[PDB]
Amino acid sequence: MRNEMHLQFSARSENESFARVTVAAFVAQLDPTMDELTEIKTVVSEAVTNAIIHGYNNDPNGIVSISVIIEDGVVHLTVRDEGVGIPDIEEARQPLFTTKPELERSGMGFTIMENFMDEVIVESEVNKGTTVYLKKHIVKS
Amino acid sequence: MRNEMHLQFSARSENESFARVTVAAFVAQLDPTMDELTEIKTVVSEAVTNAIIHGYNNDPNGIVSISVIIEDGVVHLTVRDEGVGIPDIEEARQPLFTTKPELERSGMGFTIMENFMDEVIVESEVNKGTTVYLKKHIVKS
Amino acid sequence: DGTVKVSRSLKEMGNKIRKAKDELSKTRGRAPTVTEIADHLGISPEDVVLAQEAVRL
Numbered sequence: 643m644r645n646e647m648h649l650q651f652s653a654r655s656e657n658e659s660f661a662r663v664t665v666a667a668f669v670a671q672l673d674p675t676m677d678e679l680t681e682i683k684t685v686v687s688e689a690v691t692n693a694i695i696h697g698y699n700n701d702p703n704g705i706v707s708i709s710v711i712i713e714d715g716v717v718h719l720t721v722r723d724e725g726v727g728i729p730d731i732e733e734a735r736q737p738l739f740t741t742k743p744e745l746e747r748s749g750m751g752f753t754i755m756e757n758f759m760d761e762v763i764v765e766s767e768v769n770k771g772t773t774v775y776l777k778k779h780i781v782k783s
Numbered sequence: 784m785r786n787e788m789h790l791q792f793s794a795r796s797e798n799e800s801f802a803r804v805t806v807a808a809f810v811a812q813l814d815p816t817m818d819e820l821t822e823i824k825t826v827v828s829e830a831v832t833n834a835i836i837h838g839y840n841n842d843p844n845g846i847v848s849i850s851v852i853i854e855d856g857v858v859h860l861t862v863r864d865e866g867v868g869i870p871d872i873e874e875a876r877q878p879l880f881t882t883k884p885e886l887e888r889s890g891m892g893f894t895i896m897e898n899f900m901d902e903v904i905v906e907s908e909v910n911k912g913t914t915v916y917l918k919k920h921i922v923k924s
Numbered sequence: 925d926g927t928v929k930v931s932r933s934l935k936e937m938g939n940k941i942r943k944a945k946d947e948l949s950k951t952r953g954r955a956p957t958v959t960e961i962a963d964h965l966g967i968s969p970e971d972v973v974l975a976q977e978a979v980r981l
């Protein structure tokens with residue numbers, strides 16, 4: 643098949659569960675397992691959470707943008723923000739690394755993303771914003 | 784509060800469930816009654832189906848556009864399509880009227896919209912597309 | 925009862941999913957599908973996803 647969806651919401655935090663539901667409900671079309679989904683909703687919470695806090699330093703006007711393109715059993719997620727951006731990519735993408743070590747969750751994030759998803763490609767450019775790929779093929783039995 | 788969301792997706796029969804769940808998840812922030820969330824959820828399905836089966840006459844390349852605005856006990860729903868358009872609005876809105884009678888068409892629809900929502904406004908132009916408003920004031924005790 | 929708050933209503937269905945999951949896992953002999961769980965509950969795959977979220981929090 644070929645199903646695509648595009649979502650845009652304010653960079654508030656109360657929109658976390660919302661981003662999860664929306665992406666999951668859409669990827670639910672691929673007939674996944676309750677786990678594959680719970681993973682997807684995590685991968686999402688990671689990227690979307692980053693944007694909200696890093697990209698827009700929690701500015702309720704930041705507007706987060708999500709894109710999902712299911713096709714031939716392969717989910718094609720994408721989260722992007724027009725915020726602050728990431729100076730060093732490979733470095734900010736290293737395990738335990740942070741800019742806001744204000745705990746509250748971890749130091750992990752690109753680790754979780756890197757883990758669950760089959761492929762994760764990041765892209766940023768100071769003040770322009772970041773565009774995280776994220777892809778996860780889903781199988782059948 | 785002023786929370787807003789914007790969703791777009793292929794005009795596929797399959798995205799009707801996706802759409803209501805998404806809207807529901809979002810309008811959920813208002814902590815409505817399971818009763819209210821159901822009406823809201825019904826209206827979304829009626830309007831998106833209408834957009835898909837009428838506006839785009841089932842053409843997947845359609846792209847339905849949804850927009851929700853939560854702002855002080857009120858839900859602001861908007862379903863839009865760059866489709867066929869409604870020749871006569873007043874006629875299309877009278878109960879039992881349909882253009883696809885020979886296709887088991889619940890004569891109802893706009894009638895359902897009008898009953899569940901507080902306000903329903905339609906703007907349409909042939910070969911331009913259609914936009915249904917829909918406003919729901921959610922109760923607070 | 926109408927004023928089921930949605931919070932309670934959604935949370936209750938959420939548990940039913942945990943249960944339906946292991947039930948079908950045994951019944952099928954492998955992890956069950958969102959759809960299969962949806963069908964086992966007389967609900968849509970989307971409502972399963974929605975209800976699930978309520979149970980985690």
Ligand SMILES: Nc1ncnc2c1ncn2[C@@H]1O[C@H](COP(=O)(O)OP(=O)(O)O)[C@@H](O)[C@H]1O
Pocket residue numbers: 688692693694696697698723725726727728734735739740741742747748749750751752753772
């Ligand atoms: N959307 C984003 N906008 C700006 N910087 C980001 C974004 N996502 C990640 N980063 C950078 O990568 C670092 C590591 O992110 P992550 O692994 O999720 O841990 P954490 O969420 O604890 O920061 C962040 O502190 C930040 O400097």
Ligand SMILES: Nc1ncnc2c1ncn2[C@@H]1O[C@H](COP(=O)(O)OP(=O)(O)O)[C@@H](O)[C@H]1O
Pocket residue numbers: 833834835837838839864866867868869875876880881882883888889890891892893894913
């Ligand atoms: N988005 C739309 N695009 C084109 N025509 C529409 C649209 N929505 C409604 N209509 C017109 O209004 C009629 C009535 O819609 P409705 O009351 O929902 O009934 P039904 O869904 O059974 O056709 C439709 O048959 C169609 O001709």
Ligand SMILES: [Mg+2]
Pocket residue numbers: 688691692750751
């Ligand atoms: Mg993070």
Ligand SMILES: [Mg+2]
Pocket residue numbers: 829832833891892893
């Ligand atoms: Mg209709």
